Each structure stands twice: as C-alpha cells, then as structure tokens.
Amino acid sequence: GEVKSVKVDNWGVFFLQKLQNFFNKTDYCDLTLQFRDNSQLKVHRLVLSACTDYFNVLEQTCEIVDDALIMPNEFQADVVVPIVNFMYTGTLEFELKMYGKLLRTAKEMNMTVLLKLLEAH
Amino acid sequence: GEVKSVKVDNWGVFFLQKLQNFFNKTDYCDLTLQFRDNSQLKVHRLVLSACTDYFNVLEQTCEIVDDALIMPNEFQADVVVPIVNFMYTGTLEFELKMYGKLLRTAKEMNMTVLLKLLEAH
C-alpha cells in the first residue's frame, strides 16, 4: 500500500519543446491577437498567463472581432511578437533600437521576469 | 539593424512551476473530466495534449454533460489522477499494485513517454 514514484528527468525541457512545436504549427491555440494592419498572431492563453496578467485585462477591456482580440495602439507586433516568442522560449530576440520600447512595454505589463532580464543586473 | 538576444536559463523549469501552481489552484483550466462517482478533475487541455492525443479522441467520442467530459469506464480516477499528475510534473506516483493497470492504460493511450518510463529499460 506504499506509494513509490519514478520520474522523467528534465521534464520542463521536454514539455517546453512540445509547446513550441504546437505554437509553430498553431495547434491548440485558443486566442487570436489582431493588430492594426489586420495581421494576426495565434497563441495559447495559458502560456501568456504564466508570465503576465496583462492579457487577462486586455480581454476584459478591448474589442473582440471575428473571435480575435483587437490589440491597443501601443501594443503592436513590434513588441508583441518578440515578447510572445520570449514567453515560449525564455529567449528574447530583438534589435537594439527596440530595447527601450520593449523595456517600457514590459514595465507597463508588469512582466517581471522580462524586465529583470532587460535590466541585466 | 542586427538582432541580438538575451535569455533566461532553465526556462522549462520556470514555466513548469507556473503551470503546476495553476493546476493546484485550478486557474485557467479549460476541461473538466468527470468520473462515475461524479467526482471531477479540472485540467488544461494543452498539458494533456503534449503527452498524448487520447483526450482529443475522448472529446470526440464521449458524452459531455454540464460542460464536463464523461470518462469511459476503464479510465477512472485510479489511473487518470496519477497519469495527469505525471503530465504536469514528470513524476508518476503510484502504488505497486497499480503498475500493470497503469502500464496497460499508457499503452492503450499510446502515451509513449509514460510507457517507456514504466518499462524502465
């Protein structure tokens, strides 16, 4: 009646890879972000939610059209795409000239893990 | 115009922890599994989907009542609860007498990562 346990090591690594693949192939995505140029980014709410509550506030305060969430003017693909990629990977890819805007954006979201990264000690 | 990048190390570890917390507090859960005794387990579809396609087949073949998915008779809490916990943690906790049933269940799901673990070389 004793409970034993066996484990898979580095589960976070394993699980992470599966999610990135899903994001790439747009499998199991349950939120569509729409930008001013009508381009759209399909994401997993849950991935978003692990790093920030900001998107919870957006779905409560922004327009929903065609099942897609209209992004506010200061939150367009130039900052959202690299921030979302960061959410999936731990890695932020960016042009240096985007540093300030990304940092200000992370602060406005209170996305602590990202602003800590951008502030680099 | 050159793209640089900075990273957070061990992102899988970080992300994993956030998801387990969500599962514990039942935040952002989007699927309710219901067992014969009317008990229910609330989960994230996406976590389920990373290890198996079985639940995709269940939502296409099983009854949906009160927004809850009726689990088939051979798929009750005795195997589902430890298998789902494994999905979130990489760890399978179980009583030895459950070994055979868990292994047969993993095989019926074609949940490769779990049956490999249970077969231990």
Residue numbers in the entry:
A (entry chain A), B (entry chain A): 2 to 122
Reproduce, without paraphrasing, sentences from the article in which this PDB structure was first reported.
Particularly, Centrosomal Protein 190 (CP190), a protein originally described for its ability to bind to the centrosome during mitosis, was shown to play a crucial role in the insulation function of various IBPs. CP190 is composed of a BTB (bric-a-brac, tramrack, and broad complex)/POZ (poxvirus and zinc-finger) domain, four predicted C2H2 zinc-finger motifs, and an E-rich, C-terminal region. We propose a general model for insulator function in which BEAF32/dCTCF/Su(HW) provide DNA specificity (first layer proteins) whereas CP190/Chromator are responsible for the physical interactions required for long-range contacts (second layer). BTB/POZ are a family of protein-protein interaction motifs conserved from Drosophila to mammals, and present in a variety of transcriptional regulators.
Overall, the FCCS data strongly suggest that the BTB/POZ domain of CP190 is involved in the direct protein-protein interactions required for the establishment of long-range contacts. To directly test this hypothesis, we solved the crystal structure of the CP190-BTB/POZ. The CP190-BTB/POZ domain crystallized as a stable and symmetric homodimer, in agreement with gel-filtration analysis. The overall structure is similar to classic BTB/POZ-ZF transcriptional factors where the N-terminal BTB/POZ domain is followed by several Zinc-Fingers domains. The dimerization interface is stabilized by a swapped β-strand that forms a long groove where extended polypeptidic segments can bind in order to recruit other protein partners. The dimer interface (1902 Å2/monomer according to PISA 1.47) is composed of numerous hydrophobic interactions mainly from alpha helices α1 and α2 (i.e. W12, F15, F16, F23, L47…). The native homodimeric organization is also reinforced by the N-terminal strand (residues Glu2 to Asp10) being swapped: the β1 stand of a monomer interacts with the β5 strand of the other monomer. The sequence conservation among CP190 orthologs from insects (55 sequences analyzed using CONSURF) show little conservation besides the domain core, the dimerization interface and the peptide binding groove. Interestingly, this suggests that CP190-BTB/POZ does not form higher order macromolecular assemblies by itself while partner recruitment requires homo-dimerization. Here, we showed that the BTB/POZ domains of CP190 forms homo-dimers with a large, conserved interaction surface, consistent with these domains being responsible for the formation of the direct protein-protein interactions required for the establishment of long-range contacts.
